[PDB]
């Protein structure tokens, strides 16, 4: 195993280093506005060394953006695919690449058999080529790597099955900035090449000047280079035709033959395309070839990529003809005119890369190595696309919830083979596809029109319901005596209970477990732990009486705490934000202990009075002018007081001090250690009154954020033996700090309401001497070092915070983990900040045609980890990565993959069992079974189950290792006949494993295994 901490990779281009050096001046470079006038030596190409040009037709089809997926499919995409089928069938030399399999699968399934055969034929013969082959072309900033893999697999499994092809070249022309997470997954999924387009214009300029637009992109910690994936970065401002034939859009526009009038399109540079004829073909070729040779100067081989396409192009048959015929006249003239020394033709993406590598292999070029990412993207001037790291945060949070439900559903149902009648496969496929669809770069990015966002939400909601059905049928089967198990596949044996989604104050969706001597004395509940190690976590349930005790299935008492159910109300009469306690339902909380990838059953029983093992939290409402807060049968009276500073400590955990406004001000790790200054503060960014406006994409603040005026907020303090909390009703945010004995959990119920042109940010102020350094993660896969650059505007120093961020000095680190992707930064030494929501009245000119005025209440969750790191073995100062500690990593897992909770829905569960998986291996803490998915239906003689195993890398800080067993996923199910290591999509077998044993992987590595069972 490579050491991912101590050896700094030596690469030709390291993006953080490059950023530190570049000036980013936005100078008018002439026709190539963000470059310079490219010059070339006409003698470079000659009879013995021609410029081979591949014109690659394409059509960017967004699976929802300004229309929904189905509206685009009906209005555009099915026509584009129907016409591509016909035109390619009829013109053997024409080529076309297709990226979005969600649309392709939708189309293909609707085709009659004759057409399906024709389609398979033009794919088999090389005319229609799939690039990437994912369900979508995902966002690369907010997406979790697990979902990026899911959607890649969903599209590629479909392609393998129906088209019998697996793309090895990736095409990503529209995500707003690019992540090294893509080559990481692609290279482990059989890919050999990839292409990206939206990178900062200064980066394009800089790499173009060094002919570093093509590089072997390896991971920032990869010293050896085995993660390397050849990457082609396009040079220009857009993937449209004006910006893909060469440096001068005014000339390239003349070669987009769809811009002539009848199609309603034209060239904004005022020179229109002209039909090619024998009389103008030489002059038109003179121009075009000159653009091609200029573009070629930016690369190292004699093979040139010329994308030919734009959004939803190649729709009309007349469009296919006008593009094809004119280009064919150009090629016939150009290839027969020796003085150009060019051979041009239509080609596919793979053809381009194959030829590039043939040149490489002929020793014609050597490519630079590169590590780093391509955030935050700016397409021009100071228009940095960091706004979408936060836009529509409700759905960004919903993405992580569904991410986990899909994993839990596939995992829980994987243990058994299911009769087709149970419709397990059907529900899982729907869930995977709706979550996969949302990975689209107008999905989770929050950059779609309002009615499209609604479509994605509805799709995700049905996916959540599908996961729940599968999960609950699976639990019932796993914990019921086999000879008693009598499933009704449409029956709800259990109701899932989720305490954080939609979340208290977002939706009253949790069921109350109703107990009573005259109706039901007790209720079984079950917890599932998708993580491959024994895990304890507090869980809570609403119950109709505060007098409830908990026992496990051996009937041992489990210590529990009951607290009131508090809801905050923006009281439009008193004009205050204050809490009301339920007088009919209460929260019972207890520590569940659950086996690795397993289940544990508990029982909640009512009694007429306080049970022996249940304690009650005290509650204190701090505000001037209080009124009574009755809590029905709750046994402890609420106390009142004027606002004041308070301190709390749960268990042996840290002691936290809060200001009289209910906000954290310090953390004391142990009883005599210092009260470390850690202050939460909420601020607001506005929008510029002149100049460019922030929108769904762009963050264009009118200066540093200003503090939210808090007034004298109502602060509620609940103190219990297992869980205490401090909640405060601030304008737009009910901010809650929850303590359970370790790092606190922070929850913000964010309702930006009607505050127009406002972005609410949550900032942490500490005295950590972090200087200009901070770390943020990329797709929940790795942490990359960021350096705040004052030579760039504030919005450029904002980065995606998909799952966590931290600052540290030599001795102390503060890590903020998130249950949802949001944008954030460290704008000053000792600070961390992360945007909560943003509401913008204006469109920001990237085509969306609206601002963001559809905000809705969202419950953001976090874990805040203050730690000493002076004893941790950290990377050197020059290393571009950072790594979590055991505690921060576990804190991230508690947000992304909490225990799942199930309430038995009927009065009595006959044949109930207490636990499942007590014999599953409890693997080392840095290892995760990211995916467990049965790959065969029940009628398959040889059953196959796929596993994706990921090991992160945690810092060694002096804590002795301890126990753990080796996890061999191939022996998790019985009767194993074969164990194979495979690509991450499970589509290709890479290694037959001796003894049918699946080895664990190395730190930061990810492997996929498939076990076959007789
Ligand atoms: C397709 O898969 C591979 C690639 O061509 C080939 O060897 C095999 O014969 C094909 N199978 C078909 C046509 O289904
Ligand atoms: Zn797009």
Short mmCIF file of C-alpha atoms and ligand atoms in Angstrom, two decimals, residues 120 124 160 163-165, ligand 1:
data_model
loop_
_atom_site.label_atom_id
_atom_site.label_comp_id
_atom_site.label_asym_id
_atom_site.label_seq_id
_atom_site.Cartn_x
_atom_site.Cartn_y
_atom_site.Cartn_z
CA UNK A 120 -27.62 -1.72 -32.00
CA UNK A 124 -21.84 -1.91 -32.93
CA UNK A 160 -23.85 -3.38 -21.25
CA UNK A 163 -26.07 -2.14 -26.36
CA UNK A 164 -23.34 -4.57 -25.36
CA UNK A 165 -20.79 -1.72 -24.88
C1 LIG B 1 -20.66 -7.83 -27.98
O1 LIG B 1 -19.71 -7.93 -26.94
C2 LIG B 1 -18.35 -8.16 -27.46
C3 LIG B 1 -17.87 -6.87 -28.07
O2 LIG B 1 -18.05 -6.89 -29.49
C4 LIG B 1 -18.33 -9.25 -28.55
O3 LIG B 1 -17.18 -10.08 -28.43
C5 LIG B 1 -19.58 -10.09 -28.48
O4 LIG B 1 -19.52 -11.08 -29.50
C6 LIG B 1 -20.81 -9.19 -28.69
N1 LIG B 1 -21.99 -9.86 -28.21
C7 LIG B 1 -23.17 -9.54 -28.72
C8 LIG B 1 -23.23 -9.15 -30.20
O5 LIG B 1 -24.19 -9.54 -28.04
#
